[PDB]
């Protein structure tokens, strides 16, 4: 057989009708106000077009030069939508919506591939697809992440370059579990090497959490390079992380949860009372809040599949007890008295169950912490001062050690992980495989949100700058002396804004400098330095004293509390000290270690990324557009403006332009005197017209090279 006989492959990607309602019945996308249309027969036309509609009336002449009319129903269901006659946001939105009810959750758009989240488990990635998908035309295979993987592959054989498969989306769009599917490709492709895929599940359970708008929420930005040699077989596997909500650990929001692994843990009997551990929520502080369960998911289960891939990776039966008497140490430290020696403002602790969370970590002298926490010794120039701290100052300094001691043993996991796939024969040729955490939107939004929405700025820029900008510039001379087209989208002001001087960034960096500066202080330097000049800040009027700021996603309103202490994430010396002189052998190295782990928070990351973006530029991307279709974390629900408005701000109908107006197929002299002529060599039966050039020739339209192959 192939994919021609009706079942799996047939049965998973379209489907036959039986009736005919075609003839010459012409269509209009009509709304009522909002973002929602209905199909609308039209009835006459000269200077507009009156349209009969018959949903709750008939006849409204109002049409014109606007208009925007249906596609015919021959093309309802298409593959590829630089195919569609016309072209506008109700005509796209109606080609994903007859894919997606016939649960064809991938469409081409152009070049890049666009994918709606199904919320249901599709039988669509098997071995028995893998092979069949295995070095395969775009032109030959239906729209799958595994053909676009397969793509990029062999254009790294085929070009000889490094390639970057870059998916885009919001929180909970798809964007991790499609990144599992690459990678899950390339494994039974060109490649023992069944770790590269238990390398993301172990990074899930310490990385993943539950939030609002996810259950598995990617709480860290990853960079995923698979290496390859000469020929093109597995070589190595490389992994990044980036801006780890660490808070997350100390505190979680209403409905949320806190990282997978502490309810993991407290669910398996390995201690069966060693780590001093008991029930899920009450007992521990950092999870007695909201949520103990997510449902159809097990806790139990979990810890079964994350000691698979510990086991598998190389991490001993020694080093997976001492990261899980971390973690019972961390929901230890958690249970504090902080309550006071004199009422006044004096810290003290009235006999707690702290010489357990001393005992796990590393046999930390129950005495000492308690000094390292309640009395921290500072200095006052050269003067060595005792510190006798407050509920709140303890509290806060209690956290620091929690949140640094995670972040900290997140970071050596990745090292650890990196010293087994990295390792072995690694150069040549790279597939990087983009996962950030997606654009996020809640109910207060912190310093973490703000890092998030600027990441997701900086990567669209890259669509933008890539798509349009970038090919319009080769266009100058050398094409139709190209108009040129132009496109109301550009992030850069945003990003101004965020960065560069004068940008939020460097004015919060000049306030972890500067001793008086609070949060009240720069909130105030924000506001006289942005409102009422740039007008993508806004200063809420009399909301509160918080400060918005416009994104191509759409604008978010970020709170100021803690800021100046995220960005100079402060541990107490003493605590640093106490930690370095420790029992247990993991734990020695999260501190005794320099090479891995001043800087302000706000630079590494600006840093991290400017050093990603520059990675990027050196490769050529893929783009993968995923789209979320609802709120509620439902399947079957297609909603009219939610979908409709991730399309408009992604640029997904512009990207369908100039890959339909320009020339998307660049070439020399080669590849076909033997050659150097444009339009003598080439003609030599049909066609002979959509091209152009001046000097260096040839520029083709996508619909010319894709007929000289076949
Ligand atoms: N292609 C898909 N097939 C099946 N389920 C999917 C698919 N994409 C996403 N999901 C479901 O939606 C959830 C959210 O997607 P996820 O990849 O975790 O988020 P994000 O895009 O933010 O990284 C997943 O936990 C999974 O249940
Ligand atoms: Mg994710």
Redesign the pocket.
């Known amino acids: 057989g192939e994919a021609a006989p009706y079942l799996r492959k047939s049965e998973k990607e379209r489907l036959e009708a039986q009736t005919r309602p075609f003839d010459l019945k012409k269509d209009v996308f009509v709304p009522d106000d909002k973002e929602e249309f209905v199909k609308a027969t039209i009835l006459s036309r000269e200077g507009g077009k009156v349209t009969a509609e018959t949903e709750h009336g008939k006849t409204v002449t109002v049409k014109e030069d606007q208009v925007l009319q249906q596609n015919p129903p021959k093309f309802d269901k298409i593959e590829d939508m630089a195919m569609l006659t016309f072209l506008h946001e109700p005509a796209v939105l109606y080609n994903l919506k007859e894919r997606y009810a016939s649960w064809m959750?991938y469409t081409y758009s152009g070049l890049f591939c666009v994918?709606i989240?199904?919320?249901?488990?599709?039988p669509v990635y098997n071995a028995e697809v893998v092979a069949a998908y295995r070095g395969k035309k775009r032109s030959e295979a239906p729209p799958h992440i595994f053909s676009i993987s397969d793509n990029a592959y062999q254009y790294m054989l085929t070009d000889r370059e490094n390639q970057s498969i870059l998916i885009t989306?919001?929180?909970?769009?798809?964007?991790?579990?499609?990144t599992k599917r690459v990678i899950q490709y390339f494994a039974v492709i060109a490649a023992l090497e069944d770790q590269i895929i238990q390398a993301n599940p172990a990074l899930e359970a310490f990385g993943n959490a539950k939030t609002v708008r996810?259950?598995?929420?990617?709480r860290f930005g990853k960079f995923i390079r698979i290496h390859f040699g000469a020929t093109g077989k597995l070589a190595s596997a490389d992994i990044e992380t980036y801006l780890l909500e660490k808070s997350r650990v100390i505190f979680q929001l209403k409905a949320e949860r806190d990282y997978h692994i502490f309810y993991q843990i407290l669910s398996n009997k390995k201690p069966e009372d060693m780590l001093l551990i008991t029930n899920n929520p009450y007992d521990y502080a950092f999870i007695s809040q909201g949520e103990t369960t997510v449902a159809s998911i097990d806790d139990a289960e979990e810890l079964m599949a994350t000691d698979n891939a510990f086991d598998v990776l190389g991490f001993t039966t020694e080093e997976k007890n001492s990261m899980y008497k971390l973690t019972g140490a961390i929901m230890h430290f958690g249970n504090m008295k902080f309550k006071l020696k004199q009422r006044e403002e004096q810290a003290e602790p009235d006999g707690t169950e702290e010489a357990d969370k001393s005992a796990y970590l590393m046999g930390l002298n129950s005495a000492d912490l308690l000094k390292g926490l309640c009395h921290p010794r500072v200095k006052v120039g050269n003067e060595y001062v005792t510190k006798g701290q407050n509920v709140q100052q303890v509290v806060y300094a209690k956290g620091a050690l929690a949140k640094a001691v995670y972040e900290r043993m997140f970071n050596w996991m990745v090292t650890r992980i990196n010293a087994t796939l990295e390792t072995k024969q690694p150069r040549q040729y790279f597939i990087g495989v983009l996962?950030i955490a997606?654009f996020e939107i809640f109910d207060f939004n912190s310093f973490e949100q703000l890092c998030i929405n600027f990441t997701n700025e900086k990567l669209q820029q890259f669509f933008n700058h890539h798509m349009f900008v970038l090919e319009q510039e080769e266009y100058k001379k050398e094409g139709i002396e190209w108009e040129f087209i132009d496109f109301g989208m550009d992030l850069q002001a945003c990003i101004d804004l965020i960065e560069k001087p004068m940008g939020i960034m460097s004015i919060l960096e000049e306030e972890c400098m500067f001793p008086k500066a609070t949060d009240m202080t720069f909130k105030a330097k924000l506001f006289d330095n942005h409102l009422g000049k740039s007008s993508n800040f806004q200063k809420p009027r009399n909301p509160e004293a918080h400060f918005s700021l416009i994104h191509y996603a759409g604008t978010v309103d970020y709170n100021i509390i803690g800021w100046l202490q995220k960005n100079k994430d402060p541990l107490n010396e003493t605590v640093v000290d106490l930690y370095k002189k420790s029992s247990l052998k993991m734990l020695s190295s999260l501190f005794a270690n320099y090479a891995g782990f001043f800087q302000t928070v706000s630079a590494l990351h600006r840093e991290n990324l400017n050093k990603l973006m520059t990675n990027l530029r050196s490769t050529h991307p893929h783009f993968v557009r995923?789209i979320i279709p609802n709120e509620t974390?439902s399947p079957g629900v297609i909603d009219n403006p939610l979908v409709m408005h991730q399309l408009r701000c992604n640029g997904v109908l512009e990207g369908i332009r100039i890959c339909r107006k320009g020339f998307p197929n660049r070439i020399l002299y080669g590849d076909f005197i033997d050659s150097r002529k444009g339009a003598e060599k080439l003609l030599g039966d049909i066609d002979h017209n959509q091209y152009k050039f001046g000097h260096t020739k040839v520029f083709f339209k996508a619909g010319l090279l894709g007929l000289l192959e076949e």
Not at 169 to 178: I, R
Request: aromatic fraction near 8%; glycine fraction near 14%; charged fraction near 20%.
């Open positions: 959750i994918t989240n199904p919320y249901k488990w599709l989306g919001e929180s909970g769009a798809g964007k991790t579990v499609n996810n259950d598995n929420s990617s996962d997606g995923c974390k």
